[PDB]
Amino acid sequence: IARTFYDGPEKNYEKTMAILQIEAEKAELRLKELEVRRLMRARGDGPWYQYPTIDKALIDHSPKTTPDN
Amino acid sequence: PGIVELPTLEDLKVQEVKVSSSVLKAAAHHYGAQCDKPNKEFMLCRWEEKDPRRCLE
Ligand SMILES: CCCCCCCCCCCCCCCCC[C@@H](O)O[C@H](CO[C@H](O)CCCCCCCCCCCCCCC)COP(=O)(O)OCC[N+](C)(C)C
């Protein structure tokens, strides 16, 4: 029965080790992402949460019919 | 926020041009021909400085 239907314990053991590593990495990545989102939303210095401002390319820098703009 | 500096009333004195608008309009073309140099200097000063206090002379 053991020869025909199953494997040794080392296979399940090391598959479990691989599964555990994947899951623990995913967990720490999730926590880190939550912290990064908190900081990027509070500070606005990150690539995320960039709210539009006015394009400076719309300003007209030509003499404006009076000297003081 | 800081004090605004202003010229004294002495530095704002000048010999005025006390002729009316009809006289000025009758002379305007020759006046623009003859007095072009200081007028253009003043307008360039005025439009580069953006401050009337910097173009009194
Ligand atoms: C000797 C007599 C006295 C003792 C009798 C012993 C009793 C044993 C017989 C009972 C059958 C066991 C039930 C089957 C459960 C096993 C299912 C599965 O685990 O088996 C797969 C293997 O497949 C097997 O073939 C299971 C198929 C059994 C299907 C039973 C169907 C019987 C129906 C009877 C119909 C008869 C004719 C009908 C006429 C109308 C495993 O997949 P595998 O990917 O390898 O895993 C890797 C393991 N390696 C490395 C060892 C290869």
Nearest chain B residue to A65, by CA? B47
- B25 within 8 A of A45, measured Cβ to Cβ: no
- 3-state SS, residue A61: coil
- B16 within 8 A of B7, measured Cβ to Cβ: no
Among residues B47, B31, B12, B21, the alpha carbon closest in space to that of A67 is found at B47
- Kindly state the helix (H) or strand (E) to which residue B9 belongs, with its residue range: none
CB count in 10 Å sphere of residue A39: 13
What's the A7 CA to ligand 1 centre distance in angstroms? 14
What is the signed CA dihedral for A8, A10, A16, A21, rounded to 10 degrees? -160
